[PDB]
Amino acid sequence: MQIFVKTLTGKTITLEVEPSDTIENVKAKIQDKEGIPPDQQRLIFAGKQLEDGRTLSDYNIQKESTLHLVLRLRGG
Template identity: 55%
Template sequence: MVLITEPTHIQVFLKNEKGQTHTYEVVSGETVTQFKAKVQNKEGVPADQQRLIHEGKQLDDRKKLEDYGVRNLSTIHLTLRLRGG
């Protein structure tokens, strides 16, 4: 017997540097890179300039959101990477 489960959809909040909060729907198993693409489409911030923070930890592109304990109704903070000059 094989049990096939549908991916779980959850809502997370993204709070930007302006204090604005937007809601995103993500799927269980979604990677940080996939989430950054959604943020780029909605916020207009290129993925390579995004720094995402959840519960004090910076999110690594190679990991999944769930690796950081992101659950339904979690808040992720968006800050911008400073460019060297």
């Protein structure tokens, strides 16, 4: 299935994922497309950040959904 990631400077990238893919593994798909280590990524949906251990089907993300990428510079 297809989900959209909207970057912090404002590009869209499209990632092919499964409902059982962890937020951890969608960050690995961002590393593929964009060249960014997962470590330096935080992801948002509906103004709420996503925990790495949770799947796409535990936040109830169905295809065509915009998850949003924020790059981390500071601790935390």
